[PDB]
Amino acid sequence: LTTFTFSGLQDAPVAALSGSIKLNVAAKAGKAEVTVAAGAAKAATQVSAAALRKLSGSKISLAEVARISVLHSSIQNYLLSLSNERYQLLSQWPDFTTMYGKDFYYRAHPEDLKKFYDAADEYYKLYETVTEFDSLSALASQVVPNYAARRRSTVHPAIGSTVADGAFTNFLLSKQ
């Protein structure tokens, strides 16, 4: 934020929109008698007109605690959201355990039964490797150095093809 903000008791929200937390104020001349209810606990206090102005005096500056970095955690979140899209189609695998009985063993061709047991072991391999979730934090470090050296540019971190092409028109089409 900036160092001087100008919000409080002026075009302010005066009533709640949710049924889960019930807030209400008293818009008087200067002051405000708020009452807020969130379940069985209740608070009904009073804020002054110069009491919301000093709220933005100290800045909160919310900053994230990550395991490695916010970059690595965002890449790992994407890899987990890809593992979920694979896992949702491993969820639709047809139940082969209903055909494990010996009334399907001796009815079927030997080669087709060997193929069927190979297919069941293949499902167990796919399912045990799609739920190795602690390997995503090591896969996400195989995207980090190439990307982070892309942003270690001599020109600018935010540079790309389109901005450099537009400025190459501006450089070329102006004289010399």
Partner: protein, 441 residues
């Protein structure tokens, strides 16, 4: 029957579930700002996490949330700059009061979204009569701090501030917007200055008014300073620093006002020396040097050293169309002091770069024995965006703090350095500018 921590626990358990939608997020944040909960960081963090996660947004909930982010003094640039999806997508649905709240609260966080600010400015200047003066002041604040140099909305705001009457807070907000825009227009600043007459209800209005007058370099107002002197205990130290800096840039002689301004800052620096930014400690040293009001022992020398650090950091991170200007002006200064060929010019340019006593590096500093001079180039960033194009208040700030070091600052501004034909004419202008300060050189 009236408790803060138990309802904090219930609001914490509200946003800690799985599938909280927009309205409960908004009303949780609104209730958190009405309960003044700066001391609790993690509950605010839960609220901003679920504020980033909620995908539906109506106009009222996005407006309540951005109001809560703004008056709560909470910044997290990711979740605020990601809130602009609901701001651009729900732009026709917004009422102009809610449009004012969303544009102000996204402007304050430095959100760089040109589609949002262009589409908000087009809405305001296409239908201007549907807006209160507070609403145009807030939209002007939002577009001013969002990196847009929108001058059409500045003119459309200046029209309404010319015809109609504003409050104290509204005028302070629009002055702060025009001061970051760099406007200095008398037909608008003088129209907003007549609102600071019936008193300022809070100190931050007067602080931003004094800072906007300092950074636009107008005058003192004789009523903003007294309304600021009766309330200089309300402000955070980085607010009273900017107030005293804007007052000393505006020529203030009130010793008691500067005493009350420094009475919150200097104990805050003595409690925590690091808590304020180095640019803010530089602003404090500027305000201490021009006004001449005193600080304690370990504060005045400390902020002098911090001004040396900040002048060096402004030297290293130059605009490189400013370093070309410093090279040009140093070449013209070496020509004007007598050099008709390239090697004398180059050696004198490389020998004009004597250093200041506080630790900084001066580009063009000449010492003829006991008399010192300084030449400083004012490129484009420190020039006013209107048609006089006079230099801003930071120019006079650096000038008046170098002048108390033993120097004589001769301003060479690039509006009056670029329109000349050759290096002889530029040498003539730099020589006339040095002679206009101290004719002993």
């Amino acid at each position: 029957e009236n408790d803060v921590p138990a309802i904090l626990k219930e609001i914490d358990s509200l946003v800690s579930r799985e599938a909280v939608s927009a309205k409960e997020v908004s009303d949780a944040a609104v209730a958190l700002t009405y309960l003044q909960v700066k001391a609790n960081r993690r509950l605010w963090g839960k609220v901003l996490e679920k504020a980033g996660a909620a995908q539906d947004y109506d106009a009222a909930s996005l407006t309540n949330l951005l109001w809560a982010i703004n008056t709560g003094g909470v910044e997290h640039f990711k979740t605020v700059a990601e809130l602009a999806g609901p701001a651009v997508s729900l732009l026709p649905s917004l009422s102009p009061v809610q449009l004012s709240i969303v544009v102000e609260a996204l402007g304050g966080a430095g959100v760089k979204n040109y589609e949002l600010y262009n589409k908000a400015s087009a809405v305001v200047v296409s239908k201007i009569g549907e807006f209160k003066p507070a609403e145009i002041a807030r939209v002007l604040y939002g577009v001013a701090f969002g990196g847009v140099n929108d001058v059409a909305l500045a003119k459309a705001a200046g029209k309404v501030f010319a015809s109609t009457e504003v409050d104290s807070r509204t005028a302070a907000q629009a002055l702060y917007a025009l001061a970051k825009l760099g406007r200095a227009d008398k037909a608008t600043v003088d129209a907003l200055l007549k609102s600071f007459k019936k008193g300022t209800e809070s100190a931050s209005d007067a602080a931003a008014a004094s800072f906007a007058l300092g950074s636009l370099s107008f005058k003192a107002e004789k009523a903003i300073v007294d309304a600021l002197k009766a309330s200089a205990g309300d402000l955070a130290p980085a607010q009273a620093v900017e107030a005293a800096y804007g007052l000393a840039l505006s020529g203030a002689t009130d010793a008691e006002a500067f005493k009350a301004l420094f009475g919150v800052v200097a104990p805050a620096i003595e409690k925590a020396p690091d808590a304020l930014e180095v640019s803010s400690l530089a602003q404090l040293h500027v305000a201490s040097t021009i006004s001449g009001a005193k600080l304690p022992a370990a504060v005045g020398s400390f902020v002098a050293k911090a001004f040396g650090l900040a002048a060096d950091a402004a030297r290293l991170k130059r605009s490189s169309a400013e370093s070309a200007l410093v090279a040009d002006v140093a070449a013209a200064t070496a020509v004007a002091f007598g050099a008709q060929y390239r090697p004398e010019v180059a050696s004198a340019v490389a020998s004009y770069v004597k250093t200041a006593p506080d630790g900084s590096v001066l580009d063009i500093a000449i010492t003829k024995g006991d008399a010192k001079v300084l030449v400083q180039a004012v490129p484009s960033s420190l020039l006013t965006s209107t048609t006089p194009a006079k230099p801003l208040g930071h120019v006079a700030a650096y000038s008046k703090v170098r002048e108390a070091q033993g120097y004589a600052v001769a301003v060479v501004p690039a509006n009056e350095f670029e329109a000349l034909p050759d290096q002889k004419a530029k040498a003539q202008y730099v020589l006339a500018a040095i002679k206009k300060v101290a004719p002993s050189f």
